[PDB]
Every structure is written in structure tokens, then in C-alpha cells.
Amino acid sequence: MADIQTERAYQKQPTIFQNKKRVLLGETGKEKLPRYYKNIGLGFKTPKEAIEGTYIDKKCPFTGNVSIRGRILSGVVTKMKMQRTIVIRRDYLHYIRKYNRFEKRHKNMSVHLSPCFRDVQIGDIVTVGECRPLSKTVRFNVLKVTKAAGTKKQFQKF
Amino acid sequence: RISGGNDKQGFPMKQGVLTHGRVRLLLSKGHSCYRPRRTGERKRKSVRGCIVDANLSVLNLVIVKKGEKDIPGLTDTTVTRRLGPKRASRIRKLFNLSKE
Amino acid sequence: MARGPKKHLKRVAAPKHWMLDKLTSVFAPRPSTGPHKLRECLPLIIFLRNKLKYALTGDEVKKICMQRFIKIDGKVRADITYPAGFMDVISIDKTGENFRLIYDTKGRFAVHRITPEEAKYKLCKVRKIFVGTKGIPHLVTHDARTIRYPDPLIKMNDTIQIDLETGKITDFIKFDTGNLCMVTGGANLGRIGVITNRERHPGSFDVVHVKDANGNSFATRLSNIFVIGKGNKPWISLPRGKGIRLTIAEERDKRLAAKQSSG
Amino acid sequence: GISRDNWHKRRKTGGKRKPYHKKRKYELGRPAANTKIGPRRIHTVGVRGGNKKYRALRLDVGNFSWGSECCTRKTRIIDVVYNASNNELVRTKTLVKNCIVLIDSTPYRQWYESHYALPLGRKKGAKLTPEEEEILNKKRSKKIQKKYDERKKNAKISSLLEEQFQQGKLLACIASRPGQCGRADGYVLEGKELEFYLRKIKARKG
RNA sequence: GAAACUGCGAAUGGCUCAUUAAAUCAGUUAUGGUUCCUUUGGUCGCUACUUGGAUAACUGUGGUAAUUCUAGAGCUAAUACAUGCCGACGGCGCUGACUCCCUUUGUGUGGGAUGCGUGCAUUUAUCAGAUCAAAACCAACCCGGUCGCGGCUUUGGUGACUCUAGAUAACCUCGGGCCGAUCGCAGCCCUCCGUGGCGGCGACGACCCAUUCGAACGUCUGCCCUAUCAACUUUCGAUGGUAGUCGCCGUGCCUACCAUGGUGACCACGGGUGACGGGGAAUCAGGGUUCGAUUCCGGAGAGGGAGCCUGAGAAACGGCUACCACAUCCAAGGAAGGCAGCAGGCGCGCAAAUUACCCACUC
Q: Which site among A92, B23, C221, D103 is 20 to 30 Å from C144 CA-CA?
């Protein structure tokens, strides 16, 4: 919040510039930084916390340098010990045709999760879309979070 | 003037190899002692250094200034007809012709 | 290994609609690089040797072309494997005849003779719209033609008409409901009907629904629809059978009843 | 030789993989430019598709922008002072993208003083009056002083730059890739970027 | 019209199945993360009535036991190699000596001597991108009118761009971006007697868009036997973050600093395979079992490993350099080599054809 330059190099959004002319503000002041953000398409909506926020993240869909294309998928949040990335589980049934019967299977995906989502928990349901390769094992990025079709965080009044 | 020669075993001398021995060099298009059979070809082959010794099969020499005496046949014989020029400015430069 | 581009074509690998025999040979003509895709053209040698039968061998085709007799879109072509395709005109001024390439309702190029005043124009589908330096607008067609200064009402998926002596636009048809079209790919290849609905998806493929003269209904991806007339009437003459696609039982019954094929 | 392939290294599970084929030419890599400060030395390389690429070994001069004033000019490069990635790059004076450098202030000072009709880099009267006062004051019929309110009411520079101009050097940041473009080229440090790197420079050695 | 120089092709075709178990391969999708000879269509006006020197074929003289080995001497060309005008600057922005009019300045004007930059590509920085709901005061005015009221305007496109087009300040590659010192057929029209040109048909060439043929990298789901294989990976990069280098481009691809991650009983990790994958083949009431080196499609490799030149395209083997295993000739100094192409031979083994004819057909 109050400081974000925790790295050895200065952190800023590309395409935003601050004028060093007409700088007078009197006894008070206003934000020296305007905010860059965009529409993703496909009927998704941009979070309020991306527009009203102050974080820097180049891999963010709403406020960074990525294009959402190809497949849209969903899965269950299962681990989150990395920084700005999480692991999600996908479960399915496989048909074996000699018998007339099914077999249970799973796979894991590592995905990139930006700030603007900040109340996610293990067992939440998440929707993701493809990007260019973002790191060695990461190809997908979080577009929406939900806990519909399931029990509450704490008691039923949540 | 000393213009080159051949070793025993027939290997040629080449300029810039500063020894009396023979050596093996990786030759390429534009060097002497090699003629490429394909575009971009290079081959490694034997050549003799620049220094003159008793070992050579033959020395090549060219007369750079004549004496007063005549050497038989070599300096008596008058020049042949050669072949004439073919580029237009070359013809003008030979006969001192005007631009018109 | 594959260290660069290939330059041969095996005869069992060649496009099915050319109708090549099984036993004369191992190879087929590889179409020359050009305005139409390898799967979607007819090489000029297959038209002169196998369709029109003016030549018995590839050498008899070579010595027809080198005499400068053959024109495609009004230009003389000496290349025997040149990739001719849909809506092109071929003219043979020495025999006095003109052709246009159009699909038969079984999904293959028909021979279709035309009158010399209809051999003066062709129909083109729009592929792209863009702006170049100094703000000049550009157009691109399904057959690689580039046009400067198009009319600002001409949009994506529309059909334009061009005169072949000058290469400039004369008139156009908008893509909208109720206009006549022909199908140029998939299983419905070579059918004709009116556009009746367009269903759209953001990402992936749009789907068009089309209605027949006999009231049948069929659908395809938007990339396979070519518009050929404002409302009910086409801007080009059409081959025998007019795109109606009768079933194998109707085709049996007409073949018995009409006694055609020298019965 | 050197190569940039994905198949020489292990999968998500920690398991090995065996080689699928010999090294291909499209997997190639090449040694680094390691560009120094010094009089121009550039070399060129042929690249995939037959195109050309430019590699700078020595550079003495660059192009820099003072974005606050809309002024850019060709300028001498003096020294390197900070590098976020590795300290051996400043110890050996190597020039790379997002490196921090010192540049000659003169062409910006000459633009400002002739545009605003005011002094900038000056200490005392002995470096104002004896020559070049005729850049500042001349005959100007109906353009003499009050019509320069279009200039004078917006002339004041930031205190952090007025302290740099008196020493004859400005801090700047490299924006081009010198080992790929053949050019060293960028922008003048200002505002909170200038506060950030002045704190980092002082906290390292001072 | 021999030879020789220059251009293009030789990266396709043909042969084999050793390696290879989420690898290859199949169906499905993506480049809004790249490159692209040729074809086809756009585009092609910021000494000059024609420049420079120098080699091959050829002529002439040689060296070595020996090879598609080559040296010294005398001549001469270009669409090879290297220079470089003319024509059509008349741009439009910024400076502003002076000058004229209402109002000494400021502020509204119209002229204007004189300088500087001024095509498309290239590197970096900055600017603008127009549209929506409702009134009331004040400075100064567009405008209909005069000393307070009506009424408005400006590239294109996608589901989505830090897209395309536009404006400003500089850079620029040079020896190291473009804008023709080239070749062949028929001749012409004239302040016109062989002159000023303008022009008909081409041929070849080159920077940049778009095509065509592709190539490369990535998404989702799919595999034979094994526990006498239960835990594995990890600055010797393992999983992730920030900045950079390298590369045609995305990316631990690699480097510095930091974090402590990632996979497994829904079988990881390890071992085996007389394992190249698929279209397919034999047998078969219904359900199945077994096979697929082999003419079509994809991959890999030219005795075994490694490195690299040329080019649009190769880590090429009918290209080159070296080590390792074989092996041919010699005057013992040296030189030359790769049939898992077609015929043919030896060895192996139960086990497999002629050292024939032709470009007539298909390409």
C-alpha cells in the first residue's frame, strides 16, 4: 500500500508519464499517477480493485501486457505457497470400452493470480484463459473467482 | 626480383608465411594455392614459407632492370602484337582523343 | 529429413475432385505457387488434357501454351501448372470459346461455356480492409488482388464486381439477409440458396443458415459463404442443375425415366 | 555450439528426459557484446532469413530526451553509476538497457538559456557578464520583456536539477539495447525516479 | 559458336528403422509471441549524349612417384567488383530586422528582409484521438446582430492491443537501408533536316506491403510390461519473482539478487521392450484376441561422437575440419576415403532376383 518500490529497480506502469510542469498544489494534494487498465472481452468484467489500486504487476490481464485468446477453463484452488501464482485441480471421468464403465482421473495446473483478487481460499472455484508462455510451467491466468454451488466460508450467514 | 618457387615434392611458396619450413593452412576463396570446387568450400593443404634456401626444385625470377649487354634470345626478341582495348574510354585514353 | 520446402505430389495424395486414374502413374502435377490454394485450384494441364481433351499427353499441352493461345482473367499465361480457381475466366481466342470455373452440385469444377460480353467481368469476395501511409484506404480480395481508394460503404464479407481490361471496381453486393449465395467448402460444397440467419460467437466460428429453391435447409461456417446476387437474382449465369442437390433415389428415378446415356 | 533449447533440462515432476535429436541450427546462441565507453567500434552479423544485426563494442556519445521540456539532443556519455542486476557491470564499466549513466549538460543548458532568456548553470557575476550576455539581451521591438511572460511564468526548474546543472553533469537512463541496435540512447532522470536512484547510489557508497 | 566468367539448382527425390514411452504420433485449437527464395496484386520524381582498375578462357615457361594439385610471365570483357550526377525543390513549420491600423506597454492585425529543418525505412522520447444527464451567476467573445439569447463540427478495425493512420523534438547504418550508369524487337512525331524528344512491345533487377508454398513454438484429451522399483527433485536450475543478456520471436533459454517451492497410491521416481507412431491387416454369433520393419502421412539417421562454411532454407554428409574404429597407394617425403541410392560381391544364417534396355509414358 504506502510503499511498492521493494525491488532494486524502480517499478512503474509503461505508457503513463508524470508532468514536471504546473506542479503547484497548495496546502493539500491529489494523485500524481493516473492508472492504466483495459477491457478483456468475452463478457468478463474488470475488478474495482484494479482501477482503484496502486500495485505493479506486468503479467496482470486488466493492468499489464497480456492477450487472452484460445481456450477458457475452470478448476478448484488446491495450493498457494508461491508468490503471484497458485495451483488448481481438474478432475474427470475416462471411459474404457471393453467394459461399459468409467475411471476417475485428475491433472494439476500452475496459474498466475494478480492482486485485485485478495480473499481467495483453498476449495474456491476459479475460471482461467490461455496466454503466451508466462514462465517455464505457466500458460493460464485467472479471470474470475467464485464460491457458488458450495458451502460458505465460516457459517451460513456469510 | 624473386617472384616465388616450388619445394621438393612440388609444393608452392606463398607470401606472408615467415619460415624456411612447410606448413598446413586452411585455405578459402581469394587465397592463392587453392581453387574452390563449390561455393563456400574450404580445404586444409600444405604450402612452403617465404625464405629462399638450397632445398628448392626451382626459383622464379623476373628482370626488373636490363644491363648494357644482351642475354641470348631472352632479351633480343621483339614484342608480339598482344590484343587491343574494347571499353570505349580505354580506346580514347590510348590515342589521346578529344571528348567529341 | 526435411531441410526445406517440397516440390513433388504423389497421385493418391492429390485432391479428390481432380478425378485422376489409379494406374497410369506415381506422380501428379504439383500446382504452381499463385493466387489460389493447392487444395482449392485446378492446374491448367488437367483442364486441357483431362477435361477438354485437346491434347493426349503433357507435351501436346506444352506446345499449345507456348503458341500464346491461352488467356486467364484476360492475361496470357505460358505456365502449364498455373493454379486457376473459382470465378476465373479462361478464353481460347483461336477456337473462339470462353469458360468460367463454377462448382457442380457434387463438389467438382464443371465446364461452363459463356457468351463473350459476360467474359468481360468477374465477382470478388472481400478478405481485408486497411489504411496505409498518407491515410490512403486499401482493399484485399479472395484471389490476392489489391485495390486503392474503394468506396467507403464496402465492408468485410461483401462481393464486388471488377472489369478485366482495367482491374477497377464497378459495383457491389452487401452481406445481409435475403441475398443469394453459393457454398465454397465443407460437405455442402456446390449448393446454392438464400441467406436466412447468421448466428455469431465471440471467439471461434460464426454459423450461417441457408434455404434452397425447393425449401430444404442447410448450414456451414461463415468462411464458406460466397454472395452472388442482391435478393433472389444472380449476377452470373449458372450451370445445369442450378445447385439443387437431389438425393440418390431421385437421381436413380430420373436416369431410368429420361433414358439418357444412349438407352 | 552454444544453444537455447528446452529439451536439455528436466520436467515438472523432477524426472529426466533423453535426447530426441542432434542440435539444430534454429536453436543457436552467440557471445555477449559487453559494450564499453570509448570511440565508436561497431561490428555486424548475418541473422536467420538473411537480415543484418548491429553489435556495438565501444560508444562515446548517445541521444537523450529531457521529457519535461520536450527537448532532445546528441550528447557525450561520461560514466556509469548504478546497475540493478550486477555490481561487476559498474566495476568494469559495461553499458546495457536500464543502466544509470552521467551525461554532459551543455546542449540542454544552451537550449534553455536561448529559449527562456534567463541564466541556468551560473555561479557568480564573473561567469555571467564578460561574454555571451548578448544571447540573453538584444533589441526586440514589441517583444522585449512583457511578451516573454509566455516564457517567464513557466521557466522555474526542479531544485534537484538546478544542483546537477552547476556541476556540468546530468543523470540519465539507457532505453535502447546497445548490443542489438548499435546505439546507446535514452532519457534524463527526473522526480521520484531521481529520488529513488540518488538514495540507492548514496546507500551503496558515500 | 568450343572454352571461360556471371546467374540458378544441388535443402526435393530415393534408402533404412538404430535411437525414442507424455517423447514421437493423432484428433482439436493459437501466434494480438515469429521468419518466409519464388508466384500473383499494390508501390516505384527527397563525366551524366555514360566514370574507375583487374582478372579467366587464350599465348608462353615450369615443379612433384602420385590426385578433378597448381606456381612465375604477357593480353582483354560485364547484369562480376567499385564509384556517382543530371532532372522537377516550386515544399511547409519555426525564427522576425523592420513596417501599418484601433488602444503609449500589454493585447487584436496584415505584411515582411534574413537564417534553420523539411520522402519512405531505422533508434528513443512526447502529444492528440473527439460522441453521453440538468440549471444559475462572471470575465471575453464565435454568430444572428449590436453597445442579452439561440446553435455546432471533424482515419479505419477486433470479443479484446502498448493496433492502424496522424502531429512534435532529435537520431540515422559508414566501408555497414531504398529511389535502375543494364539487354532485345518494330519504328516514329517535329520553330524540321537529322534534331528536340515521347513513345509502342517487352526482358532482367531491387527496398517495402499483401498473397502462395511452408517452417517453428505453444493449448486440451489419448500409451505396452514391471513394487524381487515407495517416495522423488533442489545454485551441479529444482518451482516461482524483479532487472538484464542471447535469440527470428514467447520462455530459467542463460546470468545476478531474492523466496522455498514442484510431483506421487487417481502409481510419481526407477528398470524392461526380438518398441519408430498413425491410416491399416489376420481371425471373428454378440463381446473380443493378435499383428503393423514394408509402396500414403509424420519423425529420425548416413561407421561412432563433436564443430562449422555458404544460403531464403542445412548444424548437409554424392559439403568441409578434428578425434575415435577400420583401411588403399608411396620413390617413406607424402596423398586419398564412407553403397541403411541402382546392379554386383563377402560375412551371417532356417531365410530373400540381372554388374540388361530407355527418357516413349508419369512428373
A: C221
Residues of D near A (Cβ–Cβ under 8 Å) read 12, 67-68, 84-85, 98, 154, 158, 190-193, 196-197, 200
Tell me which amino acid residue D174 is: I
**How many Cβ atoms are within 10 Å of D121's Cβ, its own excluded?**
18
| C206 grid coordinates | 460464426
Question: Could you give the angle at the alpha carbon of C240 between the alpha carbons of C225 and C44, nearest 5°?
Answer: 70
Name the one residue in this structure whose C-alpha cell is 479462361. Answer: C90
C-alpha cell at B91: 580506346
Phi, psi for C129 (deg, rounded to 5):
-130, 130
CA–CA separation, C136 and C147 (whole Å): 11
Q: Concatenated DSSP letters for D152-205?
A: HTT-PPPHHHHHHHTTTEEEEEE-S-HHHHS--EEEE--HHHHHHHHHHHHHH-
Element (H, E) at C123: strand C121-131
Strand D185-188 vs strand D61-66: parallel, antiparallel, or unpaired?
parallel
From residue A35, give the alpha-carbon distance in Å to each of A52, C5, C210.
Answer: 8, 49, 48
**DSSP per residue over C17-72, as a string?**
GG---SSS-SB-PPPPSSSS-TTT-EEHHHIIIIIS-S-SSHHHHHHHHTTT-EEE
Separation between Cα atoms, residue A28 and residue D36, nearest integer Å: 47
* The length of chain C, given as a count of residues: 263
Rounded Cα distance, C49 and C20, in Å:
11
Q: Which residues pair with A140 in a beta bridge?
A: A130
Assess contact for A74 and A127: CB atoms under 8 A.
Answer: yes
- Residues linked to residue D64 through DSSP beta bridges, in sequence order: D73, D186
Q: Helix-strand-coil percent breakdown of chain C, rounded to 5? A: 15, 30, 55
Grid cell, residue D84, equals: 540493478
Instruction: Judge residue C202's burial from the number of C-beta atoms within 10 Å of its C-beta, 0-12 exposed, 13-18 middle, 19 or more buried.
Output: exposed
Backbone angles phi, psi at D150, to 5 degrees: -55, -25
CB A130 within 8 A of CB A70: yes
Beta carbons of B47 and B12 less than 8 angstroms apart: yes
R_g over Cα of chain A: 20
Q: What CATH architecture does domain C2-117 belong to?
A: Roll (3.10)
R_g (Cα) of chain C, nearest Å:
20
CA dist., res. D105 & res. D82, Å (int):
19
Q: Give the whole-angstrom CA distance, residue D62 versus residue D97.
A: 13
A2-152 in CATH: which number? 2.40.50.1000
Contact of A21 with chain D, judged by CB distance below 8 Å, is answered with yes
- Pairwise CA distance, residues D28 & D2, whole Å: 6
Does the C175-245 domain belong in CATH 2.30.30.30?
Answer: yes
d(CA C217, CA C196): 9
Chains contacting D (3 or more CB pairs within 8 Å): A
Cα A90 from chain centroid? 18
Cα of first residue to Cα of last residue in chain C, in angstroms, is 56
Query: What positions of strand E are covered by protein, i.e. any atom < 7 Å from a CB?
Result: 10-14, 19-21, 23-24, 29-33, 35-43, 50-53, 57, 59, 62-66, 68-78, 96-99, 105-107, 120-127, 155-162, 164-166, 168-174, 176-177, 209-223, 232-234, 237-257, 259-266, 268-270, 287-289, 295-302, 306-317, 319-322, 333-336, 360-363
> Per-domain residue ranges for chain C?
2-117, 122-172, 175-245
On the CB side of B75, CA atoms within 13 Å amount to: 11
> Could you give the CA distance from residue C157 to residue C124 in angstroms, rounded to a whole number?
10
- Resolution to one decimal, Å: 2.9
To which residue does cell 452470373 refer?
C236
Architecture of domain C122-172: Beta Barrel (2.40)
Distance CA C170, CA C166 (A): 10
